Amino acid sequence: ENLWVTVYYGVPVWKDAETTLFCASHNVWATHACVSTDPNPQEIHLENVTEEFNMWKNNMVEQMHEDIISLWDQSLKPCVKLTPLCVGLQCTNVTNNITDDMRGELKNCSFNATTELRNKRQKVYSLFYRLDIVPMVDLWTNYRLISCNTSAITQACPKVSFEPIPIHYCAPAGFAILKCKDKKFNGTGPCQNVSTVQCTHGIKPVVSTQLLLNGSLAEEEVIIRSENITNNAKNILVQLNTSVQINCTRPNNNTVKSIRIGPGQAFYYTGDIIGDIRQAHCNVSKATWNETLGKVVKQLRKHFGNNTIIRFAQSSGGDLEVTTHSFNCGGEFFYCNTSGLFNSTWSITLPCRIKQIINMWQRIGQAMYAPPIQGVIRCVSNITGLILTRDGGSTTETFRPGGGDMRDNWRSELYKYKVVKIEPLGVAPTRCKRR
Amino acid sequence: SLGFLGAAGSTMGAASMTLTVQARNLLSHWGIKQLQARVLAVEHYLRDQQLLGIWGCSGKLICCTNVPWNSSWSNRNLSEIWDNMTWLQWDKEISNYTQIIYGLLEESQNQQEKNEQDLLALD
Amino acid sequence: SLGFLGAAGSTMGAASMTLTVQARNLLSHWGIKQLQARVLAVEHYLRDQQLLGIWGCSGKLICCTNVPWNSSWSNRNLSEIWDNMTWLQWDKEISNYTQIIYGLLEESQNQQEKNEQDLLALD
Amino acid sequence: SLGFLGAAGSTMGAASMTLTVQARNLLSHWGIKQLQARVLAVEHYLRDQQLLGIWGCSGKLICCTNVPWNSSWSNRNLSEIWDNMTWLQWDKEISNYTQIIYGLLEESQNQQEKNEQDLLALD
Amino acid sequence: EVQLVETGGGLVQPGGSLKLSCRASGYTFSSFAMSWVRQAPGKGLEWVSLINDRGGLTFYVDSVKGRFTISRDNSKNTLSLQMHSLRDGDTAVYYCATGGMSSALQSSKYYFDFWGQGALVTVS
Ligand SMILES: *[C@@H]1O[C@H](CO)[C@@H](O[C@@H]2O[C@H](CO)[C@@H](O[C@@H]3O[C@H](CO[C@H]4O[C@H](CO)[C@@H](O)[C@H](O)[C@@H]4O)[C@@H](O)[C@H](O[C@H]4O[C@H](CO)[C@@H](O)[C@H](O)[C@@H]4O)[C@@H]3O)[C@H](O)[C@H]2NC(C)=O)[C@H](O)[C@H]1NC(C)=O
Ligand SMILES: *[C@@H]1O[C@H](CO)[C@@H](O[C@@H]2O[C@H](CO)[C@@H](O)[C@H](O)[C@H]2NC(C)=O)[C@H](O)[C@H]1NC(C)=O
Ligand SMILES: *[C@@H]1O[C@H](CO)[C@@H](O[C@@H]2O[C@H](CO)[C@@H](O)[C@H](O)[C@H]2NC(C)=O)[C@H](O)[C@H]1NC(C)=O
Ligand SMILES: *[C@@H]1O[C@H](CO)[C@@H](O[C@@H]2O[C@H](CO)[C@@H](O)[C@H](O)[C@H]2NC(C)=O)[C@H](O)[C@H]1NC(C)=O
Ligand SMILES: *[C@@H]1O[C@H](CO)[C@@H](O)[C@H](O)[C@H]1NC(C)=O
Ligand SMILES: *[C@@H]1O[C@H](CO)[C@@H](O)[C@H](O)[C@H]1NC(C)=O
Ligand SMILES: *[C@@H]1O[C@H](CO)[C@@H](O)[C@H](O)[C@H]1NC(C)=O
Ligand SMILES: *[C@@H]1O[C@H](CO)[C@@H](O)[C@H](O)[C@H]1NC(C)=O
Ligand SMILES: *[C@@H]1O[C@H](CO)[C@@H](O)[C@H](O)[C@H]1NC(C)=O
Ligand SMILES: *[C@@H]1O[C@H](CO)[C@@H](O)[C@H](O)[C@H]1NC(C)=O
Ligand SMILES: *[C@@H]1O[C@H](CO)[C@@H](O)[C@H](O)[C@H]1NC(C)=O
Ligand SMILES: *[C@@H]1O[C@H](CO)[C@@H](O)[C@H](O)[C@H]1NC(C)=O
Ligand SMILES: *[C@@H]1O[C@H](CO)[C@@H](O)[C@H](O)[C@H]1NC(C)=O
Ligand SMILES: *[C@@H]1O[C@H](CO)[C@@H](O)[C@H](O)[C@H]1NC(C)=O
Ligand SMILES: *[C@@H]1O[C@H](CO)[C@@H](O)[C@H](O)[C@H]1NC(C)=O
Ligand SMILES: *[C@@H]1O[C@H](CO)[C@@H](O)[C@H](O)[C@H]1NC(C)=O
Ligand SMILES: *[C@@H]1O[C@H](CO)[C@@H](O)[C@H](O)[C@H]1NC(C)=O
Ligand SMILES: *[C@@H]1O[C@H](CO)[C@@H](O)[C@H](O)[C@H]1NC(C)=O
Ligand SMILES: *[C@@H]1O[C@H](CO)[C@@H](O)[C@H](O)[C@H]1NC(C)=O
Ligand SMILES: *[C@@H]1O[C@H](CO)[C@@H](O)[C@H](O)[C@H]1NC(C)=O
Ligand SMILES: *[C@@H]1O[C@H](CO)[C@@H](O)[C@H](O)[C@H]1NC(C)=O
Ligand SMILES: *[C@@H]1O[C@H](CO)[C@@H](O)[C@H](O)[C@H]1NC(C)=O
């Protein structure tokens, strides 16, 4: 046909790409780091566009992970270090009324701390959780802080909230984010109801293990997502289509006192407890949870067999940070025992521990001291998904709560988004020639 | 009227009428990540504009050239390419030949500029 | 001749002869502030050059188009506008219609560019 | 063909066939240093493109104007400039006169734009 | 089936004007170029004018270039021709035809695919 090459600029095509995204949105996150969000939800549906997604090869997860860790470290860096408190403690039993489940959990410790002046010392009394102290043999002491033998303990800055707030990860111009608006989306493979957005809906950096809190719900049915469901070494992300409300509390009324440990420094500690001492706990409605697991096994049988028995069991062992359900509540860190939720074959109260000196990730060499919060803490949150691991062990599959790899927490979200690079240039044969 | 990339699933013919809809969307310590992203957006825009300049297509969105289609890059007729295909499918179909086509376009302009210069040198 | 904005207070018909004077002055940790300032200046420049490209005015300072002037945008006669008014007063007067005009300019080029392609497709 | 600067030692005529080879290689604390390098490269590119636009040479690598050559700048004939001479030697000779030529190019294009505007205003 | 039916007028005096209108059906009107071709009562066919598929471009024979205007309305699927300053030499049957041009992204034509019934235009 005597066709000629015609060059078109502004062609609606793209290629998969990895680029640097920026965030948009008294707090760890979105202090000054993030750009004010454009309030207009400029979402464009792409009719007849099928896009292949892979939530386990999504570089937005790696960027979200690095951004959260970086912001966490930036928040804690300009704060009071507790190296002057790495001294032996004289600890005795708490003299208040202790319930059966709190015997030895909390101890009344005393120590000689520094003051505003280098040449002075003060005797300080405080209540520490057993998890935060370890035995030591010394002259006039019994225990020392658990992290002083590993790394410096940094006190979190007071009045800087750890509450997760939605963060929007937005693409630079020349790039676009595609969303998969597909009900019951597998999390991998072609997605027909693709749409283009400038950026995400606002993802809360909620940190938890085993149970996914304050996330997004499935549009119609529970969705089982796994990189390779056959391989038991992979974690399974279960997105629920209904929330399960979990009510977590620390009923003790804490009286919080503070001391100076140097010029301009301050250390916060629990001074005493008002009322009886009770164990922290979470209440999960029994009927709702039973229906939730019924739905989960109903979905699992599609991959494991219509006639297979599915069993749930508690975690297999290891560090508290991964064997229990870790979460932030009111600024406090709860480590709840989930064996009451995953103990079955196909009101529930879960006891919880509180730990003030924590390692936020698997990395070793850093530690943070979470200051106590005055009063009584009660949180109401939605369980929106589960992290499950399949037992290696033949029939009757056994599932357990998963771990704390964090990427799983940031794959429950960001599984429907892909970043693509726009390629405005293209060529095509036309009948048009110069002159 | 469909917005940025709204024509992505439409045929090449229909999509060719929305070039300006998305062309405007190519330009528009934590400071470094955002600043680098802005610089990269600028570098990609400028590389595409420079490439259009090399081909003699500066300032145009639909630029006709003097390079013939050789029927080996793709042997589809215009009816199938423009009425029964999208730009994503076309881009995939001739991806392996884009560097060849771009090279020919550069060579074509190099000859054309000399010809214009020679025509302009006649009194 | 008069300076960077020397013609700013002159009438439109006089200031229009100094467009190169203003055009040449649009391009030229503390490093972050300096880089953001330079990147922003570049981004604004490119936004204007891209917009001129969309309208078919790339490479020109005085670009004539095929969009008719609407008497509802400004009902002043041509002599009154160019002989007795400055560009600042005009910019204020036409501010509420600038985006309307820009939209029409884009539409005009989109039609013209397709028409040029069809004229070029005649053997 | 000869590489990025392969024609650097060739005569001015021969090196005029490689303008795209050099043109396509102009665009492509550690973060601050990398950003300053990228921004500076972009600013140099844009200043040169703006300057070509001011002269009416936007989108071209070889551009012919209406400014006559003054023998006071160089009185060598074409057989001494486009042959038997390289671009480096020429740049060394046309140093003190570069700003004069650029000023004349700007004025010539300003007159060209006004003349085109008047011609296009004739019904 | 494709149909083109002219609904134009008849006899006009020299120096006057007449408008022709062609109703098209059976195909997508906006996808084809349109033209007017005339045949004097005792002669062969003569091309008069051509309009593109979008209507933006028009072409005429020199003998009518300053007198005839060709236009289209793609919402009503009609083609119009306004003939000014009619001359005695313009007496002819005027046929509405589909074809004659392709809008760059279509295969080539340069021929007329469909012809209408034809209106008879006379000049006194
Ligand atoms: C999942 O999401 C839910 C919310 O959807 C979270 O629950 C919220 O958690 C935040 C933070 O813990 C709660 O905010 C706190 O509320 C306290 C009580 O607020 C009451 O009183 C005030 C009086 O002004 C009313 O405005 C308000 O509506 C309530 O009636 C405040 O006292 C807290 O402020 C104190 O602590 C913060 C610490 O950051 C300091 O900055 C303040 O200065 C002050 O000392 C704080 O505002 C919020 O109320 C909870 N919501 C609900 C509905 O209960 C879950 O925690 C979240 N889950 C996970 C795992 O992230
Ligand atoms: C932790 O131990 C300290 C030291 O015994 C207790 O503080 C004393 O408590 C008695 C009452 O039992 C007071 O009369 C003293 O004046 C307190 N001394 C100081 C230095 O504070 C403290 O009450 C104990 N706390 C708990 C919860 O058992
Ligand atoms: C969570 O609670 C369960 C039940 O209290 C604990 O399971 C017990 O673990 C011990 C470990 O030595 C076993 O001897 C018991 O037989 C288990 N009990 C039951 C009923 O099976 C579990 O260890 C607790 N986990 C955490 C992390 O605290
Ligand atoms: C600023 O305004 C003054 C007048 O107030 C301009 O100067 C003269 O104005 C008269 C008005 O009739 C003109 O005829 C003269 O030709 C103007 N003088 C010159 C030297 O041109 C003055 O030019 C205005 N300034 C600018 C920068 O435009
Ligand atoms: C403290 O409580 C623990 C609980 O197991 C008990 O074994 C210990 O003897 C108690 N010590 C004192 C001094 O009361
Ligand atoms: C002290 O640190 C070492 C090295 O990290 C560790 O092996 C040891 O268990 C720690 N001490 C206690 C009492 O846990
Ligand atoms: C929990 O789910 C309900 C569903 O209606 C919703 O209204 C509520 O806001 C959710 N709560 C949280 C904390 O996400
Ligand atoms: C969907 O997910 C399952 C596991 O949930 C996986 O085996 C399968 O390959 C995925 N892809 C498709 C197209 O079903
Ligand atoms: C999943 O893991 C099993 C382990 O035996 C392996 O054989 C299979 O190929 C893996 N599948 C995928 C899709 O990676
Ligand atoms: C949990 O349930 C128990 C049932 O006895 C109740 O006493 C307790 O107050 C509940 N706690 C919360 C936080 O809902
Ligand atoms: C409640 O849990 C038991 C566990 O054995 C199960 O058999 C029963 O069907 C569940 N009931 C529901 C989901 O209504
Ligand atoms: C699991 O449930 C059974 C009763 O069905 C109970 O005997 C057993 O102790 C429970 N295990 C855990 C770990 O809660
Ligand atoms: C704790 O006790 C103090 C005693 O003064 C009281 O003011 C405070 O309100 C109590 N807080 C709670 C949460 O019961
Ligand atoms: C999607 O395909 C349908 C097929 O009938 C078509 O009508 C529609 O216009 C297409 N969508 C786009 C955005 O081109
Ligand atoms: C284009 O080619 C296809 C076969 O690939 C054929 O069916 C179709 O009719 C051809 N169209 C034209 C207009 O030649
Ligand atoms: C001018 O604007 C008015 C706004 O009502 C519109 O009706 C009119 O058609 C426009 N005219 C032109 C020539 O653009
Ligand atoms: C322009 O309008 C003004 C309004 O006062 C009038 O005085 C002037 O004569 C008009 N000029 C022309 C050329 O129509
Ligand atoms: C633009 O619109 C505002 C609306 O409040 C009006 O006040 C202003 O006068 C308008 N400007 C012009 C130049 O018409
Ligand atoms: C260098 O000079 C020789 C003649 O001495 C010539 O043949 C050769 O082509 C020149 N090289 C270049 C790169 O122009
Ligand atoms: C050439 O340059 C000289 C420099 O002194 C100047 O005097 C002369 O007028 C210029 N000639 C032209 C034709 O521009
Ligand atoms: C150019 O000038 C040189 C000066 O030496 C002379 O030899 C040469 O012949 C001149 N060439 C022409 C073509 O006039
Ligand atoms: C430019 O001026 C300087 C002044 O010192 C002079 O030395 C140099 O030779 C001049 N250059 C040319 C090319 O005439």
Author numbering:
A (entry chain A): 32 to 56, 66 to 141, 150 to 309, 311 to 395, 413 to 459, 463 to 504
B (entry chain B), C (entry chain F), D (entry chain E): 519 to 546, 570 to 664
E (entry chain I): 1 to 52, 52A, 53 to 82, 82A, 82B, 82C, 83 to 100, 100A, ...
Article passage:
We found that adjuvanted protein or mRNA-LNP immunization of rhesus macaques with ApexGT6, an Env trimer engineered to bind Apex bnAb precursors, consistently induced Apex bnAb-related precursors with long HCDR3s bearing bnAb-like sequence motifs. Cryo-electron microscopy revealed that elicited Apex bnAb-related HCDR3s possessed structures combining elements of several prototype Apex bnAbs. The primary hurdle to eliciting Apex bnAbs is believed to be the low frequency of bnAb-precursor B cells possessing a long (≥ 24 amino acid [aa]) and acidic HCDR3 that can penetrate the glycan shield and bind to the positively charged surface within the Apex epitopic region. We designed a slightly improved germline-targeting trimer, ApexGT6, with affinity for additional PCT64- and PG9-class precursors, and we evaluated B cell responses to this trimer delivered as an adjuvanted soluble protein or mRNA-encoded membrane-anchored protein in RMs.
The RM017 liganded structure showed the expected 1:1 stoichiometry and a tilted angle of approach relative to the 3-fold axis, similar to other Apex bnAbs and their inferred germlines. From a top-down view, RM017 used its extended long HCDR3 to bind to the center of the ApexGT6 apex, similar to PCT64 LMCA binding to ApexGT2 (18), but with flipped heavy and light chains. The HCDR3 of RM017 approaches at a similar angle as the HCDR3 of PCT64 LMCA, with both forming beta hairpin conformations to penetrate the trimer apex, though HCDR3 of PCT64 LMCA penetrates deeper into the ectodomain surface. In contrast, the flipped chain orientation of RM017 shows the light chain making peptidic interactions with outer-facing C-strand residues of protomer A, whereas HCDR2 and HFRW3 work together to stabilize the N160A glycans. Beyond its central Apex interactions through the protruding HCDR3, RM017 also interacts favorably with the engineered V2b loop of ApexGT6. RM017 has a 17-amino-acid LCDR1, similar to DH650 (macaque CD4bs mAb, IGVk2), which may represent a light chain feature in macaques. In the cryo-EM structures, we observed a dependency on the engineered V2b loop, where several germline targeting mutations are located.
